[PDB]
């Protein structure tokens, strides 16, 4: 029996992970006391990937909540999910990294990485078999980005035969006013290129765009964005949590979706995306869900998939739907829009149907795609990095922690090489 070790680093990672574990426990029929209360036996099957079954039917998550400040742990414990998590798995330092990637990757991350590796080894030693690691963090902040990439490197050192999956939240200027978030984002992107096998590029710009235009919110808070990411992250791991045809159990998902070792950045999406308290007025059927699944306005990374080619797609449908109509609509989408898919990867759109929908929606359509359009996101973050780096703003806070100035140029060159590789595999034709 395989099992994923979940890690949450930073404020954004902790908040999104708390909302994510709430939605997952609601989908699996688990209350906050760790007792099963659902009416279906399908929810109890393949529960060992995420929930650690303790004695007397106690389902605690295998979440390792990491920060450099205890305020996020106090905020998690202030919610209902505080007693749900393992209290020994909470790790926090004394002071935060303060939006410094060097201070979260070289000093405070170095002093906390031994304790978090001790907790990782404590979770790993009780495994009958380890599947891989799932990390939720943010590329913008200091502790999230820096200690996330340091923990990624340490996990790759200790367990090099295990897959590494990240849910990396790319920062935006439309949601945060901190200026050095391109520095932390580009240095973490340079680490995630070389040290990670699977990355779900969630963009706060795309979440702000969805909450601004689609959800009609004048002032989108962090709650609406975290609700969107919790919905999409519950939909993405519905292949891992439930048995199915396209099981895609982490290594199988990486084998299907990743053709090239650096082009492992996915573009998650969720077709009936609605704000909280308003999802009961959405008409749900198959072809509208498929036509909203591939919409650029609906996709949760700030990219235009019409401007790129889908290298590999993993469309998973959720709810009570006929698989004949779902497969007919997706073959119609693939054939009628054959210019948007690569011709050198035959049958790159994989369809699965899970009969358990997310709560609040009768039918759902959650999409994973290794689209080539994510080079627009990397171009945007690299151009903000170049605008903040060509005249060396705030480099003294990074070079004062022992970071060389060659590391910024190496990160810029690696992300530009990744953009060049994406453009090369877009322009090539079989």
């Amino acid at each position: 029996m395989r099992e994923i070790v979940h890690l949450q680093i930073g404020q954004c990672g902790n908040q999104i992970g708390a909302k994510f574990w709430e939605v997952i426990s609601d989908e699996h029929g688990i209350d906050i006391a760790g007792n099963y209360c659902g009416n279906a036996s399908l929810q109890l099957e393949r529960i060992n990937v995420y929930f650690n079954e303790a004695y007397s039917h106690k389902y605690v998550p295998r979440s390792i909540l990491v920060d450099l400040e205890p305020g996020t742990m106090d905020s998690v414990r202030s919610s209902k999910i505080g007693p749900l998590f393992r209290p020994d798995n909470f790790i926090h330092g004394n002071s935060g990294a303060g939006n410094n990637w060097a201070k979260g990757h070289y000093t405070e991350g170095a002093e906390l990485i031994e304790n978090v590796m001790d907790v990782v080894r404590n979770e790993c030693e009780s495994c009958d078999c380890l599947q891989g690691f799932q990390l939720i963090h943010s590329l913008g902040g200091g502790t999230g980005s820096g200690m996330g990439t340091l923990l990624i490197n340490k996990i790759r050192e200790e367990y090099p035969d295990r897959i590494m999956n990240t849910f990396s939240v790319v920062p935006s200027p439309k949601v945060s006013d901190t200026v050095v978030e391109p520095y932390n984002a580009i240095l973490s992107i340079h680490q995630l290129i070389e040290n990670t096998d699977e990355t779900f590029c969630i963009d706060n710009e795309a979440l702000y765009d969805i909450c601004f235009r689609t959800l009609k919110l004048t002032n989108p808070t962090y709650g609406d964005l975290n609700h969107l990411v919790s919905l999409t992250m519950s939909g993405v791991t519905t292949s891992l949590r439930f048995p199915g045809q396209l099981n895609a159990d982490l290594r199988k998902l990486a084998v299907n979706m990743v053709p090239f070792p650096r082009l492992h950045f996915f573009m998650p999406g969720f077709a009936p995306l609605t704000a909280r308290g308003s999802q009961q007025y959405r008409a749900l059927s198959v072809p509208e869900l498929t036509q909203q699944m591939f919409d650029a306005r609906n996709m949760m990374a700030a990219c235009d998939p019409r401007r790129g080619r889908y290298l590999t797609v993993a469309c998973i449908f959720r709810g009570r739907m006929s698989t004949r109509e779902v497969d007919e609509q997706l073959l119609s989408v693939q054939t009628k829009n054959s210019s948007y898919f690569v011709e050198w990867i035959p049958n790159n759109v994989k369809v699965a149907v899970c009969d358990i929908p997310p709560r609040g929606l009768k039918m759902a359509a959650t999409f994973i795609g290794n689209n080539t359009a994510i080079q627009e996101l990397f171009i945007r973050v690299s151009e903000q990095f170049s605008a903040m780096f060509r005249r060396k703003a705030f480099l003294h806070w990074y070079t004062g922690e022992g970071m060389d100035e060659m590391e910024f140029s190496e990160a810029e060159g690696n992300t530009n090489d990744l953009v060049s590789e994406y453009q090369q595999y877009q322009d090539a034709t079989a």
């Binding site: 200027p173 200026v179 005249r391 703003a393």
Partner: protein
Amino acid sequence: MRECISIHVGQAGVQIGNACWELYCLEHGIQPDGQMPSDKTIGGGDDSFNTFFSETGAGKHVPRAVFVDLEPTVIDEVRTGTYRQLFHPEQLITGKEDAANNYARGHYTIGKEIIDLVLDRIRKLADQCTGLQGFLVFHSFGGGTGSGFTSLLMERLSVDYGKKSKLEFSIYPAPQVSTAVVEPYNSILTTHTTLEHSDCAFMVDNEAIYDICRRNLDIERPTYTNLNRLIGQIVSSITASLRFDGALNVDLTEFQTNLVPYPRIHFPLATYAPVISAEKAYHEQLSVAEITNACFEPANQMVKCDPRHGKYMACCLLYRGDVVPKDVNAAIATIKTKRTIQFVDWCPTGFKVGINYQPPTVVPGGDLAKVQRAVCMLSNTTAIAEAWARLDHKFDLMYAKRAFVHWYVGEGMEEGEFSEAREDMAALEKDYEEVGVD
């Protein structure tokens, strides 16, 4: 957990710091002997004025101050004044021979014979503090002590306290009240020496304070007392974010991050709106929008330069008194509709408003009027390059024929140090122009 050691080098620094500590005791309600009516009921520290006022066992609020001069005149003046028992006699350092308006005397010959005593007093004051952030060095660009000994002290505090950040409150020289002719020489030399050793320097010229006093307080002969009271008001509401509750700029690191992008571009400009005379106290009131406009008025700054010809980088609007935060955003929007304020081409954030509800207190018997709404605008701009260009123009005028250079080479300095400081200030002018060109 946060402690600051104010250092007052030179006559200007000592007098400005004495006025500043008078206004700090006035704002915090501290009695001149050291006791406190209200906040000594607890009897403990860390009440956010423990950054500056250390509390002894007797309840005396002795300040974390070091007063340095090479002349015992103003030190005896503060040893004779109304706060003679507030300051410890060990921390008030006098000298025998002055620096005589010479940088090389205060940096190489006269200041080198007293630097270890001042370092010993600094370490003795730092050993009491368990959470020390850094220092606030009060000095002047023009004088001998306030330039040379400040540069020597900045070198010593960088080689000894390298994990700490050092603020500065320098006095830029004015021709209206000038004690010397070689003030451009000392100013350029101490700016070259304290460029790698200062983290955020708030230079204020006496020309702007002179013009503000003459055009607002109606004094056509402003003495050093009126200038001292006004600059004490300016620096007191600069530091009012630091000695009070936490909204913004609560630390020296917050000062270095909110305003200072480069290690060399670290010269913000303060601006104060309600500078009104004590006679015109009940004539009218002042709204938030007009005091924000006067904080964006170029004639109200602490530096005589024009910000509309340069490009901004930051703005930390610091409101004092009973100011409701609703109309501050309307004032921000009316400022933003004026496209004279033009930020840089990066993510510019905006006017970081923080509001302190403690009312501003003026000195009784001073020329400043008691007001209910006060505002400080810390702005980093490229307009300070005009002031440095004026200084380097006077430096080039005096150095074209090598006037007064023998007073500096004769006290241990080299001839090439003048050209090195001129090239460093040319590089600072180039850096300010490169930020100014986009």
